[PDB]
């Protein structure tokens, strides 16, 4: 019966910057994605592994919600195997990404006159960022010989810089909010199911079944196969259910 607090996520009044990107683990809901899908208020809505319509009527076990504010020009970087500032030093989707990524113009909310000095993005590093690697460290990296001693100096100032976000900018030079979905599957039962309504079960007849998104055709009969409490599925040699 419970639903997903997408309201407080998307309609949130405050967003953190990309390097300090926030996370909200969400579970055990009934999800209606069509409310967003057909909202038609989103400048961009793409994802990989699942069509929107097909995901709406499907169950998943665990989902994460991540959000930040980037630049328009760089929106494309939020995709598997991209390069640039953000891909390298602020955020990097894994290649086999199975979530969903969304972005809309927020020039009317996040931009402000004189330039918004809030949001930040990491600039330099010794190495590439691993999947979902957060780096809040403002430690002055030392690419030289002389000691750094914390102070900002002739070697490698803060790997943290703020956007301008003047409203008077072009399209690509204006902030676009972003919300990255994550869809993962484990052996745990699917908690975040779609808005589908169950039917009664009919035994000893050839039926078209759907159990938690698992489909097939066959006759459902009682059994004496004693599943252990943690086991949900049994399998044949063919790897079929």
């Amino acid at each position: 019966t419970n639903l997903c607090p997408f309201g407080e996520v998307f309609n949130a009044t405050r967003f953190a910057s990309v390097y300090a990107w926030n996370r909200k683990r969400i579970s055990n809901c009934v999800a209606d994605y069509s409310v967003l899908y057909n909202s038609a208020s989103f400048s961009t809505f793409k994802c990989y592994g699942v069509s929107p319509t097909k995901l709406n009527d499907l169950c998943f076990t665990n989902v994460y919600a991540d959000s930040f504010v980037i630049r328009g020009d760089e929106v494309r970087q939020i995709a598997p195997g991209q390069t640039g500032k953000i891909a390298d030093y602020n955020y990097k989707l894994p290649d086999d990404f199975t979530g969903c990524v969304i972005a809309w113009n927020s020039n009317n909310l996040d931009s402000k006159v004189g330039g918004n000095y809030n949001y930040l993005y990491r600039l330099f590093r010794k190495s590439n960022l691993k999947p979902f690697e957060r780096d809040i460290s403002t430690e002055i990296y030392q690419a030289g010989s002389t000691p750094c001693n914390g102070v900002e100096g002739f070697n490698c100032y803060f790997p943290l810089q703020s956007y301008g976000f003047q409203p008077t900018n072009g399209v690509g030079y204006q902030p676009y909010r972003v919300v990255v979905l994550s869809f993962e599957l484990l052996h745990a039962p699917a908690t975040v199911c779609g808005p589908k309504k169950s039917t009664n079960l009919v035994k000893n007849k050839c039926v078209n079944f759907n159990f938690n998104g698992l489909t097939g055709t066959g006759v459902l009969t009682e059994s004496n196969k004693k599943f252990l409490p943690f086991q949900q599925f049994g399998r044949d040699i063919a790897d079929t259910t």
Partner: antibody
Amino acid sequence: EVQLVQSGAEVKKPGASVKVSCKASGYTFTGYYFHWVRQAPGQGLEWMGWINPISGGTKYAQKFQGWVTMTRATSISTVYMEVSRLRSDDTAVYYCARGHTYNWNYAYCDYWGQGTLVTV
Amino acid sequence: VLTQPASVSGSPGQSITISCTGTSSDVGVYNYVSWYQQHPGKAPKLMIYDVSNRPSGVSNRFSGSKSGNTASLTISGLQAEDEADYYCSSYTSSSTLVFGGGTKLTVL
């Protein structure tokens, strides 16, 4: 164009403190250091220190360490400079000046404010 | 820290020079000199950066040089409006900015 507008002229008694403001505009406020330089009447230029608007990192002149404080407010684009335990020798025109953002560098102060005369 | 002559004078149209003497921790290489012009009752403006480079709007008759631990500012075709205090400035010890004492240039 770069504009730096300082607070008006001050008079203090010996032993008191003074806090001078420098309002910045016409560029990305946080993207550049602010220097303070002072000049006693009929005398040369004396470097006081630098402040980074990002986080608030400072370095002072050695001679003023322990009675100069530099601060900034990023919301209003204003840098402040406070001097405590004032003496007659602290009678000077106090300039804020905008510079580079790489700390270790020559010719730091490029764009200068109008100057604040403080008399002690 | 840097040493300048207190006064330099010249007639309109002449060339004058202003010396700046430092050390191996400032003016000596690795080092870059800047020069400021301070017109009477005004803030300093940058005149020369990087030994000899001029900001836009600085005329070609202002020229800077550096040799070892000394620097010089040359002003050719001296004009009345050149009457100002001139400061050399330099980076010091890979830690701090230092100034010269200032040179009052007077035009005769």
